[PDB]
Amino acid sequence: MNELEGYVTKAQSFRFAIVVARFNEFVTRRLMEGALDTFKKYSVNEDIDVVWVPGAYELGVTAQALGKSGKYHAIVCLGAVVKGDTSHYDAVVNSASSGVLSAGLNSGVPCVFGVLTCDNMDQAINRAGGKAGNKGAESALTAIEMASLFEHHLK
Template identity: 40%
Template sequence: MSSAHKNLSVFSTTGLPDISQKKFAIIVAEWNSEITEALFEGAYQTLVDNGAKAENIIRANVPGSFELSFGSQVFAQKPEIAAVIAIGCVIQGETKHNDYINHAVAGGLTEVALKYNKPVIFGVLTPNNQQQALDRAGGIHGNKGDEAAITAIKMLGLQ
């Protein structure tokens, strides 16, 4: 189901694992900061609301979404980090740069997750325009940051 038909901030919390002792890294792209800050706030608050301690949530910034893979790897390799959430936004624009960036980031984050055998969550918006991004960063379609955090928590339940 596309996010145009689903609220990203509505999800089941039944059976979530205890995350009170887990450490999370949230890697935030600075590009499109109006959007990524809202996504970060959503992810952070969802973690706290579901039992994470504020002192166990580490934030790191990277220049843009392309750098999320490396930033995520820096934290995924640390044994104390249980899960990494990568936050970014690549708006389509007039060229095809978004196709290359989004493909590289998705592949890079998957590679990091498999290499370090821990959840590395794709919290990257890939909208066609600024309004679609705003709609998914706390707007009418909820907040992708919320969804990314709950995904990290649920994935920890597999371990």
């Protein structure tokens, strides 16, 4: 019993990267803006890199890279894939999810899965600062905590 929890207060010193898919920009832009804001709100400053990728599928390798560059402590990946029609949804969703996972694992760097996978657009709108909160921001906050966790727990 020794609660090794991350610290949300010791931000500023860290370096983060946001990776966002342009798809469903209407939401993602917001999502991102949210994450961004949260960072600053949490005193962090090293002017976080935001990498734009066209689609959620992309998140995987992109994070992969950024992670392996050892330049950041945590990368948060944002995207939104609304269940529009076909299983294509699934396809992407899986790849997206899987990718981010693999990235984090392989890089040994926390990669935050801040991608919406709701059915209809509306639900999404809510996760992007609606009555459902803002995944973007949450993700950022998480990025912080994780990073911090890593340099406090380390082992």
